[PDB]
Amino acid sequence: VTMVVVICVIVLNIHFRTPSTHVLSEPVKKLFLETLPEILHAQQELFSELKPAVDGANFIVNHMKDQNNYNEEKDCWNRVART
Amino acid sequence: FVFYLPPDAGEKMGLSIFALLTLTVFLLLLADKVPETSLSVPIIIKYLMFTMVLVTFSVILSVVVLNLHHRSPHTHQMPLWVRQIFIHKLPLYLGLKRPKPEPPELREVVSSISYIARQLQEQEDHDVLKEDWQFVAMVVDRLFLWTFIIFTSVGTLVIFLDATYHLPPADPFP
Amino acid sequence: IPCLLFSFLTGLVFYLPTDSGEKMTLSISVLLSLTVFLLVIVELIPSTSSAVPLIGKYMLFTMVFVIASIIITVIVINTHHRSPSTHVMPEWVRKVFIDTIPNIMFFSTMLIKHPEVKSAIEGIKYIAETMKSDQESNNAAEEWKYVAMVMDHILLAVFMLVCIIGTLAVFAGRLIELNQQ
Amino acid sequence: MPLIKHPEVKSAIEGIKYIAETMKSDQESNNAAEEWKYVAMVMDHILLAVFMLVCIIGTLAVFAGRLIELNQQ
Numbered sequence: 233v234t235m236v237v238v239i240c241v242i243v244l245n246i247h248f249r250t251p252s253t254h255v256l257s258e259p260v261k262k263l264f265l266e267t268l269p270e271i272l273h274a275q276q277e278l279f280s281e282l283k284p285a286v287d288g289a290n291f292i293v294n295h296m297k298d299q300n301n302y303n304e305e306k307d308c309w310n311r312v313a314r315t
Numbered sequence: 316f317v318f319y320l321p322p323d324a325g326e327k328m329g330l331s332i333f334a335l336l337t338l339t340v341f342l343l344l345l346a347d348k349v350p351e352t353s354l355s356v357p358i359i360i361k362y363l364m365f366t367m368v369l370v371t372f373s374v375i376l377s378v379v380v381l382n383l384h385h386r387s388p389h390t391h392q393m394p395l396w397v398r399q400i401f402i403h404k405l406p407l408y409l410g411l412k413r414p415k416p417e418p419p420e421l422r423e424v425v426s427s428i429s430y431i432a433r434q435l436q437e438q439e440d441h442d443v444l445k446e447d448w449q450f451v452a453m454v455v456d457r458l459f460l461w462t463f464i465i466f467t468s469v470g471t472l473v474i475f476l477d478a479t480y481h482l483p484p485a486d487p488f489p
Numbered sequence: 490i491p492c493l494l495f496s497f498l499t500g501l502v503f504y505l506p507t508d509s510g511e512k513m514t515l516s517i518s519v520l521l522s523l524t525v526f527l528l529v530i531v532e533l534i535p536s537t538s539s540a541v542p543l544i545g546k547y548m549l550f551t552m553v554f555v556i557a558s559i560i561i562t563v564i565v566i567n568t569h570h571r572s573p574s575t576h577v578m579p580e581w582v583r584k585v586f587i588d589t590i591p592n593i594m595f596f597s598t599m600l601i602k603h604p605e606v607k608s609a610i611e612g613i614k615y616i617a618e619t620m621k622s623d624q625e626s627n628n629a630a631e632e633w634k635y636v637a638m639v640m641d642h643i644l645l646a647v648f649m650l651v652c653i654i655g656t657l658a659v660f661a662g663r664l665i666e667l668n669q670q
Numbered sequence: 671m672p673l674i675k676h677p678e679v680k681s682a683i684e685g686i687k688y689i690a691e692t693m694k695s696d697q698e699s700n701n702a703a704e705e706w707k708y709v710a711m712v713m714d715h716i717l718l719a720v721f722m723l724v725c726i727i728g729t730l731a732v733f734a735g736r737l738i739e740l741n742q743q
């Protein structure tokens with residue numbers, strides 16, 4: 233039971249690893265997500281007013297992209313923890 | 316091993332304080348075995364009280380770590396000395412590295428889009444101040460793990476060497 | 490010594506933030522530890538009813554301390570989770586916990602009219618107003634959170650002070666007499 | 671259960687499309703999650719009924735024979 237608690241602590245450390253805290257190594261990711269899962273189982277007056285809109289739209293798009301990358305690496309760590 | 320648990324798991328108290336509860340159960344176990352005299356303290360009682368103090372200190376340090384982790388980024392500002400010690404200096408000695416390298420109709424649309432952009436910028440700034448506190452909490456948790464390991468090893472070795480080297484006398488009458 | 494160790498852990502729940510979700514775990518399981526240790530104390534100490542012993546008074550003080558910490562922690566958690574819409578912030582709480590607590594201030598924040606195009610314009614506007622309303626609710630939620638945090642900072646010091654003071658009041662009255670003897 | 675094509679405008683349009691497809695995929699994944707959630711809720715209901723029935727049956731059948739025997743003699 234003591235060893236299982238230690239295992240649970242390690243698995244929870246693996247599960248809650250975050251992009252801003254840890255680096256997902258490619259050998260680790262390839263080992264724990266491919267191998268072991270298989271083994272186990274004018275035109276400027278307009279632009280004077282549209283430039284803030286275009287810049288803001290680009291910012292929102294980049295923010296969504298960064299959040300999606302963050303989330304995807306989070307599910308990658310979760311899948312490693314499950315394996 | 317409570318210091319290796321993430322703060323985001325929400326299980327540090329549920330582990331350390333339940334270890335304390337189990338230690339109380341073993342105190343009940345020994346309550347009917349030890350001598351009741353007061354001339355000295357049994358070494359096994361010394362060891363049990365030492366282990367209880369260790370677990371009690373694990374709870375205290377875990378509470379400090381969780382206070383650092385869940386610290387509101389807006390109402391609690393980082394002192395510059397915390398930033399200097401726990402982000403730049405001690406991570407290098409503890410083996411921790413942060414991955415971060417450090418028309419009337421259209422006018423309403425423009426204002427709205429700028430409002431979303433500004434709100435998202437504020438969200439990123441608040442996030443950054445959040446991860447600073449969280450990284451300080453992690454560093455303070457790796458330091459506390461190492462000092463807990465050191466204190467545990469030193470105390471356990473001292474008590475066990477005191478116990479093991481107590482031999483019967485080879486002479487019935489010194 | 491175990492009673493002292495359980496007593497020192499009682500006030501530490503007031504250093505635990507509410508957003509951890511482990512405040513009542515700590516308090517209730519310290520109570521469980523005390524309750525289990527009651528078996529040890531009953532097994533060890535005399536069972537007499539002529540008068541209350543000093544150990545009996547210390548055990549009762551520790552238990553009442555843990556109960557008070559549990560009650561006040563529940564009050565703190567209730568204050569932390571007050572909804573901005575249902576529960577309006579009274580002015581007296583704001584004055585006494587956001588204005589008159591200026592002691593330790595490490596704190597802060599004390600012609601294209603197609604229906605589809607018009608609908609897109611209105612949807613963007615609606616999105617912005619939605620996020621604005623969410624921010625406005627979060628601000629008052631955070632005000633209540635600040636009040637609960639201030640209450641926890643006060644009560645941590647209060648509880649550690651009482652933990653020292655009650656123990657000294659229980660034991661010094663006889664320890665000083667023995668030193669004089 | 672007019673023609674103003676420019677490298678920064680095209681990025682905004684493509685990113686708006688990306689945002690829409692992102693919340694489309696998120697909605698699909700979320701719905702697939704609520705399906706399993708509905709399944710787990712259904713097993714919770716069935717096993718609540720089953721466990722209360724077994725609790726009643728065990729409170730009765732263990733004590734039934736000796737209580738009726740004492741009623742009779």
Ligand SMILES: *[C@@H]1O[C@H](CO)[C@@H](O[C@@H]2O[C@H](CO)[C@@H](O[C@@H]3O[C@H](CO[C@H]4O[C@H](CO)[C@@H](O)[C@H](O)[C@@H]4O)[C@@H](O)[C@H](O)[C@@H]3O)[C@H](O)[C@H]2NC(C)=O)[C@H](O)[C@H]1NC(C)=O
Nearest residue numbers: 352354355477478479480481482483484485486487488489
């Ligand atoms: C187990 O318990 C025993 C007691 O129940 C312990 O026995 C004691 O051991 C000590 C040390 O060996 C003895 O003390 C010694 O006594 C001799 C003899 O003293 C006599 O002769 C001298 C001569 O000059 C005289 O001056 C004295 O007054 C006596 O008449 C001394 O020479 C030594 O210096 C020393 O004092 C005890 O006498 C002895 N007690 C008994 C009752 O036998 C035993 O050691 C314990 N075993 C352990 C701890 O392993």
